[PDB]
Amino acid sequence: XXXXXXXXXXXXXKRISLDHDHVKVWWYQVSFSWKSIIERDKKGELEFREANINQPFGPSWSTTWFKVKISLPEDWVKSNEQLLFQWDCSNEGIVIDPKTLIPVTAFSGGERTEYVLPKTSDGKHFFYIEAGNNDDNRFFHLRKADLDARALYIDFWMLGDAARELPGDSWQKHQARQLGNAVMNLFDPNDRSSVRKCRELLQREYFDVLTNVYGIGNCHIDTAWLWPFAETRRKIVRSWSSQCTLMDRFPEYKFVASQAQQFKWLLEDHPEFFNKVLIPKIQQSQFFAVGGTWVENDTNIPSGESLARQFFFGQRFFLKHFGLKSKIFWLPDTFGYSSQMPQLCRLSGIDKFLTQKLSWNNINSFPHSTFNWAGIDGSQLLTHMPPGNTYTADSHFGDVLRTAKQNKTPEYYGSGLMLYGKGDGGGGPTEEMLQKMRRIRSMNNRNGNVIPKLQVGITVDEFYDDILKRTNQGHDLPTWSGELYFEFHRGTYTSQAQTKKLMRLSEIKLHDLEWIAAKTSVLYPDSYKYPSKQINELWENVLLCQFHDVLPGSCIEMVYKYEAVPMLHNVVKECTSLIDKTVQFLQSQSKADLVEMRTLGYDDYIVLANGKLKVIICKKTGVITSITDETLGVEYLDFVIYDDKPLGWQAWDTELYSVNQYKYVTKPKKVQVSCNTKEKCAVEVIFQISEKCKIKSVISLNATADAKLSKVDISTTVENWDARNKFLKVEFPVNIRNDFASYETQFGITKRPTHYNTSWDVAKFEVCHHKFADYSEYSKGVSILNDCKYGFSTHGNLMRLSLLRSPKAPDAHADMGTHEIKYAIYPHRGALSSDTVKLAHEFNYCFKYKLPKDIGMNFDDIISISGDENVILSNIKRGEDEQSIVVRVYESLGGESFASLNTTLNLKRIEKVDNLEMKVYNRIPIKLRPFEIASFRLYF
Amino acid sequence: XXXXXXXXXXXXXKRISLDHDHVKVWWYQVSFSWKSIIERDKKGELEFREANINQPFGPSWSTTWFKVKISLPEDWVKSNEQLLFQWDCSNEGIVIDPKTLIPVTAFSGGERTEYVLPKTSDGKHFFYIEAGNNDDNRFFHLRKADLDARALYIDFWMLGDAARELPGDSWQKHQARQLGNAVMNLFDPNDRSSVRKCRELLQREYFDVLTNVYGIGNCHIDTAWLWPFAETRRKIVRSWSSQCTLMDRFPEYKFVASQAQQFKWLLEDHPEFFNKVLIPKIQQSQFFAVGGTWVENDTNIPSGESLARQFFFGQRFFLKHFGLKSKIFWLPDTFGYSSQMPQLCRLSGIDKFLTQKLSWNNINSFPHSTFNWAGIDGSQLLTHMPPGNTYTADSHFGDVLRTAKQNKTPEYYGSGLMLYGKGDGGGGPTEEMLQKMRRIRSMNNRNGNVIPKLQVGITVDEFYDDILKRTNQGHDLPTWSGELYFEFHRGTYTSQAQTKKLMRLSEIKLHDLEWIAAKTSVLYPDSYKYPSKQINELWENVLLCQFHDVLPGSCIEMVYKYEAVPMLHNVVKECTSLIDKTVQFLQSQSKADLVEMRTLGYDDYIVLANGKLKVIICKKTGVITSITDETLGVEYLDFVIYDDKPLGWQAWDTELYSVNQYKYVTKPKKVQVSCNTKEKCAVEVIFQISEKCKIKSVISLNATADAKLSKVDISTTVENWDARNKFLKVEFPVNIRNDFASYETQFGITKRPTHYNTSWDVAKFEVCHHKFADYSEYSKGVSILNDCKYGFSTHGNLMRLSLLRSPKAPDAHADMGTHEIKYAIYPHRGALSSDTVKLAHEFNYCFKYKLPKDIGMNFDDIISISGDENVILSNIKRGEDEQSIVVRVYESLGGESFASLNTTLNLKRIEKVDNLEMKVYNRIPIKLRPFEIASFRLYF
């Protein structure tokens, strides 16, 4: 059918010319800054040397600079020709043509790329290019030219490619075939006069339901990944330069940036001439900042304060010369989404959101891609969702009509959605031939509006103007309550808990000193008292490791050591330095000060004797048998049984072997008890397994009301040895029947069933959590507190916490070494149903005691008339510039009770203020809605 | 998915009003003309009587007239309402509102239909409507109205229907669903104000690659079918009237007519006011005559003279006030096509052709639907071919986008093809809502040219202007040599040979007297001599039964008796009257005249002794054993073995039972011989079968050079009895190996293989032929002459002629009764290879002898210096208006030899003239091309 005759023939087979200049070429390498090397160039004879040939290398962390001094050949003849220099793209680097140094040019784009030499100025210039190693040898040759001949070659390549994508039943496929025919006729027998003429004839063969197809070129950059931050800091400057050279070459282009800190990275590295580059670039057009967010992160693990700073400290750039923005919120690589996001968005002045994964196309009780998200708070979020092709559809895309068809099926709207650029790497490239892409697509389809029109230059702001018109304001709409569920690729989330232990301890610790440091305002006045400039710098370093890829611990071994480096550590070390600092001139009013933040036995007979409860491990079995309440009457049989099953997948996802029996840790145990006291009781029982390894958990608790508490504390200490690729968990089967699982999400409590959605794919079902998870019919249940482990699962009502994971990924630090784990099991009652939530989250508190000399009185309870047990205040902090402070509260128990808010203060005034710390004229609500975040601001 | 919620809901469920007028209504019936009944109405009391109710009936050939006298209700109120009268469509009839009689109105349209009452004139009028019976009772009620409300109901019905046809993956399907949603909202709770308003809102929801989709409303009418000619003569006037009322209602509409005689039928029936109706109708626009052909017929069975008259005598209307024409040639219902058609078309001034069946979509060594036909003559024919959906795609079509997709796949072009109207019935209807159809399709798709534009008002003449531009003039193009092959539905073609015997004998007989009647021109001058006006009327009646459906004998029993009526008979009877007439004053120069047209034994030892050949039937077997040539050396084993196999299909197609053994006629035969002489030898052998029936064939031949001839003559006489649904054939296996079968088509010899094309579907393979079929390696072979049987088959080189067929169709005359059949078997040699063709075709000649008184000399051979054995002159005749005569010749043997043409005459001049008898300035060719028809004209 002549299918392989037209397609594979001409696609393979003045005009393009290749000249070679061997001399004047220099090479440089550092085996030990662009401004530092410019002074080391002209002076004497340094490591800069003549290359003139291909330079091989070997694996190193070193970077290799390269210098090419080119003299323009002849005068007029080769000037009209297009000047070009081809380079082989290495792992990283930069390219410059500095005098002395004005420019910064793009590198990080794909292995194929073009560098244009200015035809405006006739003379000799210089070139500075470095190549990051990880080895990749560069192929460098000068390439002259024509533009019209190469255009036809590209247009034909995108022609026949579009012929294959078009339906064979349509006449267009037979048309495009005949179009690929006539072109091949004059193209074959090597004729320049025919090629240029045939290009004109092809255009004549080209030009002879309201819908729209658009796209926005973007670069998604991970600040920490298998390449480090310092190296990727050089990678982000390559993303800006590719646009700058594209602007003069092509107009109407659109770029978006998920990092507000990206601006600062460029302003710190290139403060001089590139601060004045951004202003005409951003203000006029062609640039948009999405979300104005300081960090792109997973929202499940951290608190709302992490989401509070990124909005506020990312809005700080708006105070500088900046501020052309968009209403879209972009978290493409983020796994999972919080249920408080619809509430956080509207308050942050951002009305749109984008989600890559976590969706399906079918009747789900859900129509399509485009979606209006209604959280459990009751608020609504209009969000724009890309199809199942994700962001890799338009990434490095020359295929034209290929994914255009697959985009139309999931989406209805009046139009589709395309995201240009790659989100996997040091940063995404932006192709320079996109100008022809938009043009050649306007060659196939006619102009005027009848058939869908092709415009790549439209902005999402105008796109959101279209959705406000076509579709109704709505009452009954696409509706999904809570979060979304698809293949999560949880992976490292529960793996390498040691980086969580450091972070989660640093999380609370940095969240510790915040508010109380504003309570010393009255004591010693200067600015009064608050580490405004001091704590601002603190949040700068911490948010850097909190990114979506970095925080769970999925990365190479090099940057993983930078996670356990002072980056995480010194934060705790500086905060523990400040907490011992501010105390000196403060606590001096305290003789003996207990510092805590709030606002108002037997062996053979196997018993630990007390009133509250009883939990018993059988003899020689090693497994807890009876957990039973006398007053309640609930008896348990199948507790705390540790289970170890291997893992055969990589760091990304988790895939267990087919029907693999999980090895129990039960063995010929021995019995022991740590101490002897009414205050302290710890009974020790040893567990062992094949390839002997010591797995230790501890038992701690306070009796009743001599010790006082309602909850046990069980901490696990395990030093891993030998066998890798294993996944360890501890089971807490409730032996109870409930279709609902109580779990506390970020700023609230979400309601999720015991069984996953019927559309679920992956066998293994695990859920990420903050602190505790419960099962409650409201008259009773079982509550499980935990530390350093964010994961858990619903087994058919068997509570299983994930202690450790060891992926087969190329990381050797995820396998062996000691670990300190902690968790708990708590008895549940209807009266204690609101108590278990209160005794869970903030239990991470660490007791600390210190005393100065005595002059004063140390008892002051300064909080004013609120007293709501159903509400919990997560964050209260100051401002930037005044020093007005903000107060943010959220209701713990919601969905049933309507919390009356009497919260107020004295000696000053108060007004309700959103999460962006921006002034809002409703006033303080006397009653809080269920599952509502209440944030306020305080002024003198 | 709410699929059956939107689609089946609102589709089922001032405004429409139904009023009943019982009085003033009259009914009439003839159990025994519109002009005859108008005088019988007002006078006295006739069979016209009060009806006022529904009138039941019973099967009859009668027609029932009906009269409704309607008085306009009130004045203004019901005047604004749309006046309508609904009738139940019967088999046939006419509808009139005569004063006294001006109008003729359309009836034959489908059971649903509308009759509009004029709102211009306020008063009382009359209605005349007759109903043909075959019984169908009419439901008649007066219907008032609004137009805007009914429009929305239709537009919505065509909306949701288009929603189902559109791909579910596209957003258009989800869009049209939402369009069907909002409409149903205000439509449900019975609100006139909402409906009229929602109709406007729907239009707002509507309006918000170069291709074209067009169509032409047409009516294909069979002049003789299961309803007779006299009754369908009333049916054709209903086709014109439907257009006339449509013209004022809607513009740009296009109609086409395959019958040039259709004009005469209307001019004979309505000569007065309807002769002046056609002129503004045809001349301006909206009407086109396709092919200008007198008859639509199968071209395989008759001669070229039948195709010659239909062009010429159909061009006679052009001499009247007429002549807006098209270049298209239309034979949709015609089974099979001649190979001389590409030659006949270009000469007739008609450059395009249309074919319904006989095509396939695949790579056949053939691209698509659109085709350039190159005959075996070497000439090219550009033809337009409808898709596999044939003409029933757009027939009675409210389905919109339904067949629009299936039309695009077989065809490439720049555009598709649609044929509106039904070709099966007394005549095709043309719907009055086509105005909204074009409009609502312009509602879905936007305007201006980007996407395909919808125009139903374009003419094929302008369509052929588009094909001359887009596609190349061409050298290598779609190419198919000879005829086309698909399921033929041969059927009645070989069935009921008795109507062929009468026609084929009438064919030659009417073709007999033609030319020689111009040879008496000199004898007795008045106009000189020729039956110009006499033979013109002869061809009028004959061509009437030669139509594609009528000629093969597929029809009801009523009109089948009209086939054996004087219609066929009197033609022979009038021609045998004229041949005995013109002879009287002509042959008187002949004492004894032999009139022929041309230009220069044993039993037990089982032998008929002579020199030329030997053919022997074995004793008691009944089957011929050895047919052998001594000089040539070819011996045959397996001849003339009659075979009878049943048939389980209808008249249309032929389907044999699965692996059914064909019963041989061999039986305990007896031997006999008719006469005894050297001049006459006939040996008789009886055959019999179960349910005893006498099957007789005869043996006749002339020996060598006392009798002289090279060919045997075997005639079969069989009187059918008992068992029906059988198919009888006689086998002549050659016992030879040839991949080619020599067969003489109409005006030439086509070359067809022994095996059917690999794309063939139906098991049984049979071929229609004129006279003989041969198998020749050119050194030898076997030639089979036959009479009254047009069918034969290729069995793997076994020659099988079809004697009779008896279909299961509702025709009882195709079963039983006597039949007279004739055929032959001829020996073949390289020297006689050109002889066998010459001894085959015209052998149908019948010897006739008569003598007058003697004065004169009877020998004159008047032909002038041609003498080409490879050429054969089929037709030479006179003109219409002068009386110049034309001469048409065609080469019998072609594909190898180039025939030198010395043909000329004396005492006058000669010029080459096409098949339309139109003057052409190349002159007489001295050499004829292979397979070329040479036609000339003679002037005084």
Curated annotation (Swiss-Prot), chains A, B:
Compartment(s) where it occurs, according to its Swiss-Prot or TrEMBL record: Vacuole
Active site as annotated: D333
Needed cofactors: Zn(2+)
InterPro entries to which the protein is assigned, alphabetical: Ams1-like_N, Gal_mutarotase_sf_dom, GH38_C, Glyco_hydro/deAcase_b/a-brl, Glyco_hydro_38_C, Glyco_hydro_38_cen, Glyco_hydro_38_cen_sf, Glyco_hydro_38_N
Cellular-component GO terms for this entry: Cvt complex; fungal-type vacuole membrane
Residue ranges of the TM segments: none
UniProtKB keywords: Acetylation, Glycosidase, Hydrolase, Metal-binding, Vacuole, Zinc
One Gene Ontology molecular-function label: metal ion binding
Primary localization: other
Post-translational modification: The N-terminus is blocked.
Enzyme class: hydrolase
Record field: catalytic activity: Hydrolysis of terminal, non-reducing alpha-D-mannose residues in alpha-D-mannosides
Cofactor binding notes: Binds 1 zinc ion per subunit.
Residue positions binding Zn(2+): H220, D222, D333, H548
EC number from the UniProt entry: 3.2.1.24
Any one GO biological process: mannose catabolic process
Subunit record text: Composed of isoforms with three constituent polypeptides described as [(107 kDa)-n (73 kDa)-(6-n) (31 kDa)-(6-n)], where n is 0-6. The 73 kDa and the 31 kDa polypeptides may be proteolytic derivatives of the 107 kDa polypeptide in the vacuole. Oligomerizes in the cytoplasm and retains its oligomeric form during import into the vacuole.
Family according to the record: Belongs to the glycosyl hydrolase 38 family.
Function: Degrades free oligosaccharides in the vacuole.
Remarks, miscellaneous: It is not specific for the 1,2-alpha-mannosidic linkage. Present with 319 molecules/cell in log phase SD medium.
Protein name (record): Alpha-mannosidase
